[PDB]
């Protein structure tokens, strides 16, 4: 995206650092959610809770991409 | 004339974001501990939901910093 960032380069180093840390966490989390998906439960409540977690994983993924684009455009 | 904000106000918003990041870290440590103390798919699911929300909060704090320091 365009240029013109107006904040500390030091923060831009460290925010990329934490975003990367958050991507690592996310991958490990999607691994845990995957495992939980196939490893065990026949209940409508249980199925719904798992779908809620699985959805939130995607929300977190898209927000990480949003934070990356905003970070390198800002 | 796009942005019109007081420098002191933007500095105090950066502080509030910092304090919220500290709260987040303490929250993630709290969850690491409580998760590590624990066979239920619901309980595991709630734990995964909390971990996700912590990740969401991380990304929104980074977004809030980026949007704040480009205003």
């Amino acid at each position: 995206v365009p240029r013109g960032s107006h904040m500390t380069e030091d923060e831009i180093r460290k925010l990329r650092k934490l975003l990367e840390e958050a991507e690592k966490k996310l991958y490990k989390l999607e691994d845990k959610t995957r495992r939980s998906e196939e490893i065990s439960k026949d209940d409508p409540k249980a199925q719904s809770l798992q779908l809620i977690a699985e959805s939130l994983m995607l929300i977190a993924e898209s927000l990480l991409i949003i934070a990356i684009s905003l970070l390198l455009s800002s | 004339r796009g942005s019109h904000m007081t420098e002191d106000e933007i500095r105090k918003l950066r502080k509030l974001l910092e304090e919220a990041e500290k709260k987040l870290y303490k929250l993630e440590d709290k969850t690491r501990r409580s998760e590590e103390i624990s066979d239920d798919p619901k309980a595991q699911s709630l734990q995964l939901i909390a971990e996700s929300l912590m990740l969401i909060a991380e990304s929104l704090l980074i977004i809030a910093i980026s949007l704040l320091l480009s205003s």
Partner: peptide, 6 residues
């Protein structure tokens, strides 16, 4: 994650 701006 810590900065000032104006």
């Amino acid at each position: 994650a810590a900065l000032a701006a104006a």
